[PDB]
Amino acid sequence: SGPVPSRARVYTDVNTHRPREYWDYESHVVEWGNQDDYQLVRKLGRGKYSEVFEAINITNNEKVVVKILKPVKKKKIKREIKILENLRGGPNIITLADIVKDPVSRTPALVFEHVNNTDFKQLYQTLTDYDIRFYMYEILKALDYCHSMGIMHRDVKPHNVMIDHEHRKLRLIDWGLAEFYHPGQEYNVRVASRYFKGPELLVDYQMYDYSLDMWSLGCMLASMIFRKEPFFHGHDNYDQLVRIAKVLGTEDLYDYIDKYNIELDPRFNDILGRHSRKRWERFVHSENQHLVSPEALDFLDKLLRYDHQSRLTAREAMEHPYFYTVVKDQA
Numbered sequence: 180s181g182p183v184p185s186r187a188r189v190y191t192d193v194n195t196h197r198p199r200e201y202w203d204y205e206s207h208v209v210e211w212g213n214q215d216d217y218q219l220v221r222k223l224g225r226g227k228y229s230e231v232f233e234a235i236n237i238t239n240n241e242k243v244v245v246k247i248l249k250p251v252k253k254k255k256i257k258r259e260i261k262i263l264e265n266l267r268g269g270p271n272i273i274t275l276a277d278i279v280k281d282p283v284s285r286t287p288a289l290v291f292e293h294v295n296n297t298d299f300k301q302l303y304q305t306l307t308d309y310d311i312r313f314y315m316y317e318i319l320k321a322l323d324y325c326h327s328m329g330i331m332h333r334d335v336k337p338h339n340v341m342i343d344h345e346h347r348k349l350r351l352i353d354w355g356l357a358e359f360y361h362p363g364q365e366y367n368v369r370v371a372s373r374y375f376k377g378p379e380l381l382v383d384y385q386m387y388d389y390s391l392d393m394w395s396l397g398c399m400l401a402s403m404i405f406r407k408e409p410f411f412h413g414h415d416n417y418d419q420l421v422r423i424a425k426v427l428g429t430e431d432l433y434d435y436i437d438k439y440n441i442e443l444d445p446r447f448n449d450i451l452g453r454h455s456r457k458r459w460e461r462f463v464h465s466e467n468q469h470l471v472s473p474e475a476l477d478f479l480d481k482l483l484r485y486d487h488q489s490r491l492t493a494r495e496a497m498e499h500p501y502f503y504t505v506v507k508d509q510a
């Protein structure tokens with residue numbers, strides 16, 4: 180028989196209660212700005228789906244970020260656009276400022292608010308215990324918001340988190356992989372970066388939900404408090420699950436497989452083996468102990484569960500003791 184169905188335990192029917200237009204991005208008509216309002220200054224980066232530049236809007240002299248898209252299905256551009264427009268003004272969500280097209284090449288480009296970011300491979304090593312709790316709380320505000328709005332980010336990782344440390348400003352960016360949550364929908368499991376893929380993606384369980392972002396957030400938190408990047412360092416997608424199983428144990432993995440009646444890929448049978456669930460203490464040492472506390476460990480444990488239904492929601496995560504001093508300081 181097939182796999183047992185699953186539903187998000189929070190914000191389950193939020194898109195159903197909305198007009199069709201809210202989530203039916205295939206019928207979205209794109210509103211285009213003037214390409215001549217922007218002059219590219221320099222290249223900032225790239226990805227599999229785009230080339231990123233810094234630009235100046237010459238009508239108001241403001242610095243912006245321009246994401247020039249490589250060839251991609253128009254419905255995927257409509258999806259990114261619709262999600263960015265729906266989430267606009269939301270806490271710590273990047274602002275989509277404009278959408279332009281080159282009149283000759285017909286290449287579309289998305290224009291974003293600029294964040295004066297410090298590269299994580301330089302910033303993270305300077306973060307104190309308080310900074311990690313502070314920035315994790317800022318990411319949770321963005322996740323609880325997009326989840327409440329019926330959207331899963333599906334690509335939560337350090338590279339998609341822009342931090343202006345001087346101004347303690349955080350933005351969750353690159354909504355190119357984000358989707359609308361619909362109960363009963365089967366999603367593509369070939370999403371997210373290897374090191375941040377949830378167990379549901381690695382076992383090919385397609386009926387996933389917002390809880391996928393919570394696994395990714397747990398991977399991020401583990402790399403920051405343990406100063407071990409990446410935390411789960413797989414050689415490929417199969418070995419990625421082996422790396423998780425060597426920490427969380429194989430018993431809870433097979434209990435998860437059995438609960439949802441998942442047909443496990445035969446490749447896994449000879450590589451998963453048998454592993455006990457490890458204690459978080461084995462990753463604690465003299466160079467990271469200042470970042471690790473019993474409440475950081477309790478919080479991390481509640482994020483990194485094989486069973487997606489048993490992970491903390493973003494709202495539950497915000498109520499965790501790990502954030503008591505951040506919450507107090509914000510009041």
Ligand SMILES: CC(=O)Nc1cc(Nc2cc(NC3CC3)n3ncc(C#N)c3n2)ccc1N(C)CCN
Nearest residue numbers: 224225226231244246291292293294295296352353
């Ligand atoms: C623009 C986007 O979605 N992706 C993206 C963004 C960047 N870089 C930056 C850099 C900065 N600020 C730094 C001081 C220069 N900002 N400020 C806001 C935004 C946004 N949005 C942004 N994006 C690099 C690569 C990618 N992609 C293709 C691969 C990773 N997913």
